[PDB]
């Protein structure tokens, strides 16, 4: 997250760190949202690599013991059937991970609330992106969970020539683009929390940014629109 602030350790309990085994250690690669005690929602591009993954819930500082972490392996990965690794702009950047064990819920580990199918946010809706991603374009990962206020940019505006044009699809949510704050490498797969009816719900799965950089004016961070996949999500969980 570029231009973020450190999140309080109990603000976003559904946020998880998706890590892969590298040598004798583990490396954070993406974010994710805990949606069931044994299911995590993330981006398809985060797991279309042949690596061994683990999920860490109740995480705050990637480099220090917080005394709240739970580590669990990934048992099954279900990527959306239409996902194409070399066509991120097409959409379908979403995947579900079934955990080897069911995590224990507490103040640091909670299920993320998903919006009702078809829900579209009004332009400039209040949302926060969270993650341990790079704090600057071509920079380095954050040690502590970061959050950044990223108001939504509706489809009509986001798909206009000055913004993303046809690159953005209606199956996506755009947020930010003020040139100062944005998601960045390492935040992918994580949540975009938006306040609706007094409750925060996860409306997006962090997907991509501009080739020009993470924080680029009129190039808001792009997320997979969760409300466009509610049926798919329920179908996968119910059959696995």
């Amino acid at each position: 997250v570029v231009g973020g602030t450190e999140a309080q350790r109990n603000s976003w309990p559904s946020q998880i760190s998706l890590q892969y085994r590298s040598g004798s250690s583990w490396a954070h690669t993406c974010g994710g949202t805990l949606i069931r005690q044994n299911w995590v929602m993330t981006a398809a591009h985060c797991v279309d690599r042949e690596l061994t993954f683990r999920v860490v819930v109740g995480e705050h500082n990637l480099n220090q013991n917080n005394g709240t972490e739970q580590y669990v392996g990934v048992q099954k990965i279900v990527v959306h059937p239409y996902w194409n690794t070399d066509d991120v702009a097409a959409g379908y950047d979403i995947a579900l991970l079934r955990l080897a064990q069911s995590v224990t819920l507490n103040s640091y580990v909670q299920l993320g609330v998903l919006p009702r199918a078809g829900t579209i946010l009004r332009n400039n809706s209040p949302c926060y992106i969270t993650g341990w991603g790079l704090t600057r374009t071509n920079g380095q990962l954050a040690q502590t969970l970061q959050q950044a206020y990223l108001p939504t940019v509706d489809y009509a505006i986001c798909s206009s020539s000055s913004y993303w044009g046809s690159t953005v699809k209606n199956s996506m949510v755009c947020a930010g683009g003020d040139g100062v704050r944005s998601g960045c490498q390492g935040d992918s797969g994580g949540p975009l929390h938006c306040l609706v009816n007094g409750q925060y719900a996860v409306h997006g799965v962090t997907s991509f940014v501009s080739r020009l950089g993470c924080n680029v004016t009129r190039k808001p961070t792009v997320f997979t629109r969760v409300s466009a996949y509610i049926s798919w999500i329920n179908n996968v969980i119910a059959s696995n």
Partner: peptide
Amino acid sequence: VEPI
């Protein structure tokens, strides 16, 4: 685009 750049996946993040």
